[PDB]
Design a protein around this ligand. Structure first.
Ligand SMILES: *C(=O)[C@H](O)CNC(=O)NCc1ccccc1
Ligand code: NA
Length: 240
């Protein structure tokens, strides 16, 4: 997250760190959202590589003992069947991870609330992106979980020529684009939390930003629109 602030330890208890095994250690690669005690929602592109993955829930600082973490292996990966790695602009950037054990819920570990199917946010709706992604284009990961205020940019504006044009689809949510605050490498797969009727829900799964940089004016961060996938999510969980 570029232009973020440090999240309070208990603000976003559904945020997870998706990590892969790297020699004798684990490396953060993406975010995700805990949606059942044994299921995580992330981006399809986060799991294109044939790696060994684990999920960390109750994580705040990637590099220090928080005293709240639970570490769990990924048992099964279900990518959206229409996902195509060489065509992120097509959409379908979403995957579900079944965890090897069911995590224990507490103030640091909670299920993410998903929007009702079909829900579209009004332009300029209040949202926060969260994650441990780069704090500058071509920078380095955050140590502590970051948040940035990223109001939505509706489809009409987002798909206009000076924004993303044809690259953005109605199956996506755009947010931000102010040139200061943005998602960035390592935030992918994580949540966009939006306040609706007094309650935060996870409306987006972080998918992409500009090849030119993270915080680029009129290139808002683009997210998979969770409310487009409710039936798919329910279908996967019910058959697995
Ligand atoms: C998931 O985290 C995202 O896909 C992140 N994407 C980027 O951060 N892309 C911008 C970028 C700029 C310069 C070099 C590499 C990537
Ligand atoms: Na930690």
């Amino acid at each position: 997250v570029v232009g973020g602030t440090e999240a309070q330890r208990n603000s976003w208890p559904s945020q997870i760190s998706l990590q892969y095994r790297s020699g004798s250690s684990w490396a953060h690669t993406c975010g995700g959202t805990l949606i059942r005690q044994n299921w995580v929602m992330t981006a399809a592109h986060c799991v294109d590589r044939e790696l060994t993955f684990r999920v960390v829930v109750g994580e705040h600082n990637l590099n220090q003992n928080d005293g709240t973490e639970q570490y769990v292996g990924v048992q099964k990966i279900v990518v959206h069947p229409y996902w195509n790695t060489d065509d992120v602009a097509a959409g379908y950037d979403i995957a579900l991870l079944r965890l090897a054990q069911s995590v224990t819920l507490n103030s640091y570990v909670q299920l993410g609330v998903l929007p009702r199917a079909g829900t579209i946010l009004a332009n300029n709706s209040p949202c926060y992106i969260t994650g441990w992604g780069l704090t500058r284009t071509n920078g380095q990961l955050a140590q502590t979980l970051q948040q940035a205020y990223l109001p939505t940019v509706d489809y009409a504006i987002c798909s206009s020529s000076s924004y993303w044009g044809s690259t953005v689809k109605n199956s996506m949510v755009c947010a931000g684009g102010d040139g200061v605050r943005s998602g960035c490498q390592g935030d992918s797969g994580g949540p966009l939390h939006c306040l609706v009727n007094g309650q935060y829900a996870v409306h987006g799964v972080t998918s992409f930003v500009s090849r030119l940089g993270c915080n680029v004016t009129r290139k808002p961060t683009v997210f998979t629109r969770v409310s487009a996938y409710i039936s798919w999510i329910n279908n996967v969980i019910a058959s697995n």
